[PDB]
Amino acid sequence: SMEVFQNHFEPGVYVCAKCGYELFSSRSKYAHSSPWPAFTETIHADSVAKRPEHNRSEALKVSCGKCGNGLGHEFLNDGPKPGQSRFSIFSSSLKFVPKGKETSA
Ligand SMILES: [Fe+3]
Ligand code: NA
Ligand code: NA
């Protein structure tokens, strides 16, 4: 079965599924009504690269800052507290690294 992180809230870090760069902490994740996992901030300042999303106001496209793999969107001023973003990310673009449990293949 494919990765679906919408309702997933375990302790760990979501990394880029393509290159492994650290993207989002479990700390930053919050429950939302949309089909995609929602986060307020990235782990590193260069975790994501941003580009305009021309056909939607208050929205940017986001990709991995290291390898360029497409991640989803940053919705400006759409987060849980005023002025926070909602990073709405494809689960297929993420791999979850659980605290304590990064076991061998
Ligand atoms: Fe990457
Ligand atoms: Na951060
Ligand atoms: Na936009």
CATH number at residue 34: 2.170.150.20
Identify residue 86 by its one-letter amino acid code: R
Q: Which ligand is nearest to the CA of 74?
A: 3
Q: Which ligand is nearest to the CA of 22?
A: 1
Which letter does DSSP use for residue 7 in this model?
A: T
Length of the chain (residues): 105
How far apart CA 47 and CA 69 sit, in angstroms, is 11
Q: Sign (positive/negative) of CA torsion 45, 43, 83, 70?
A: positive
Q: Which of 60, 69, 62, 61 is nearest to 21 (CA)?
A: 69
| Residue range of the domain that includes 40 | 1-105
Distance 40 CA to ligand 2 centre (A): 9
* Three-class DSSP category at 76: coil
Q: Which of 72, 33, 28, 29 is nearest to 49 (CA)?
A: 72
Number of domains in the chain: 1
How far apart CA 105 and CA 98 sit, in angstroms, is 14
Report how far apart, in Å, the C-alpha atoms of 38 and of each of 20, 27, 44 are.
Answer: 19, 11, 17
Is-contact 52 61, C-beta < 8 A? yes
Is-contact 73 62, C-beta < 8 A? yes
Count Cβ atoms below 10 Å from residue 59 Cβ, excluding itself: 18
Q: Which ligand is nearest to the CA of 56?
A: 3
